[PDB]
Every structure is written in structure tokens, then in C-alpha cells.
Design a binder for this molecule. Structure first.
Ligand SMILES: [Fe+3]
Ligand SMILES: [Fe+3]
Length: 208
């Protein structure tokens, strides 16, 4: 591995394994709709590199029942999570990575709402609990957004049927559609359907 990629494996082995899995999912979707597969693959490898700044605050790096967000305000939690896109982009820039890889790290959550920490701060304005974006500017980044959300949800679920996995994927796509996250790229509804069906198929080769 390249020094940059190995620093992900060493500091945040969960994030690493997660990123490899996303790359697999997302590249398969890129194939099926004839998007830029190789940009998608390598973009996923680095998309979460901003988590290397504070690895234990991301669940894929945590041990069961040991969550550092307990000793934190929602605000503190939000500031750490919302930062990792911007921080990843900055790390990538400082390492003179190609701009499309930089764009992916910055945009892969679009402007989505951190809803958990948003409605824990009920028990205040949405804009403060949303990623800075921009929203995905390309089909490729939209694919990654969906794949990334799907990977993490299935990973953290215990432990899912094909029916559950389908439900998770449809929920996320619905969410993205209703929240307008894909209105600044050219991804088609037909492509969304292909992506959706490819994720179901790939994930079942993985969960049997
Ligand atoms: Fe991320
Ligand atoms: Fe991710």
C-alpha cells in the first residue's frame, strides 16, 4: 500500500476495511451504468481519510459498548463527525492528490443531516447539523454516497436478511431523493434503480 493508504490501515483499521468494502460496492455499480469505475474505486479508498485525525469517534473503529461520544456534548460530537469530509479533503490536498479524489472526500455525504445528533439536541437549526457539502456533483460521487451509507448500515446491523438489506437500501435512496441530495448531478432515476439492484446483488454474494 501507498503510505497514505497504509496510514488509514494503521490508525483506523475499521475505516480501512469499510473503505475497501465501499469501493467494491460502488465500483460494481459504476460498471453496471458505465460510469468511471477506476475513479470510483480509488476515490473510495481515500474518502474517509479525515477520520484518521480522531479514529475512535467513528463506530467502525469502536469496540462493542465502548463509545467515546458518551463523554461529549452533541455539539462536540457533531463537530467531530461533520469535520471528517473537510479534513479528508485537506489531507488529500496537502498530499497533492488528484482533485477528483479530493472532491469525493469532500462531497461524499453531500449536505445530509446528522439526524441522530440533531434530534438528541431536541431532548436548534438543521443547518448546523448538516455537512457543508457541496452536494454530489457527478454520477460517480452520487454512487459513492449511496454505497457508503449502505455499507455502514448493513455493517452495523445485526445481522441482516436479504429483506432487511433491501429495506435499508430503499430507505437510503428514498431519503436521498426526498432531501434533494442528487439534484446537482446528472444521475438518472433509471441509474438509481440499477444501482439499487446491483447493491442488493453484490451484498448477497457477501452475506450469502
Ligand atoms: Fe464519511
Ligand atoms: Fe465512509
Amino acid at each position: 500500500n501507498h503510505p497514505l493508504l497504509k496510514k488509514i490501515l494503521m490508525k483506523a483499521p475499521g475505516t480501512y476495511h469499510h473503505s475497501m468494502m465501499v469501493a467494491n460496492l460502488a465500483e460494481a455499480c459504476a460498471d453496471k451504468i458505465g460510469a468511471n469505475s477506476l475513479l470510483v474505486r480509488v476515490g473510495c479508498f481515500y474518502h474517509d481519510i479525515g477520520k484518521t485525525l480522531r479514529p475512535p469517534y467513528f463506530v467502525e473503529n469502536q469496540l462493542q459498548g465502548i463509545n467515546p461520544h458518551d463523554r461529549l456534548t452533541p455539539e462536540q460530537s457533531r463537530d467531530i463527525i461533520l469535520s471528517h469530509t473537510k479534513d479528508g479533503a485537506e489531507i488529500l490536498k496537502e498530499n497533492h492528490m488528484p482533485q477528483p479524489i479530493i472532491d469525493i472526500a469532500l462531497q461524499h455525504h453531500g449536505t445530509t443531516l446528522l439526524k441522530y445528533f440533531y434530534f438528541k439536541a431536541k431532548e436548534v437549526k438543521e443547518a448546523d447539523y448538516r455537512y457543508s457539502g457541496p452536494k454530489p456533483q457527478t454520477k460517480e460521487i452520487a454512487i459513492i454516497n449511496i454505497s457508503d451509507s449502505v455499507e455502514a448500515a448493513v455493517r452495523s446491523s445485526t445481522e441482516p436478511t436479504m429483506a432487511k438489506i433491501t429495506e435499508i437500501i430503499d430507505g437510503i435512496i428514498k431519503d436521498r431523493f426526498l432531501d434533494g441530495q442528487f439534484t446537482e448531478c446528472d444521475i438518472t432515476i433509471q441509474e438509481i434503480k440499477i444501482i439499487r439492484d446491483t447493491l442488493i446483488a453484490t451484498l448477497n454474494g457477501i452475506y450469502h
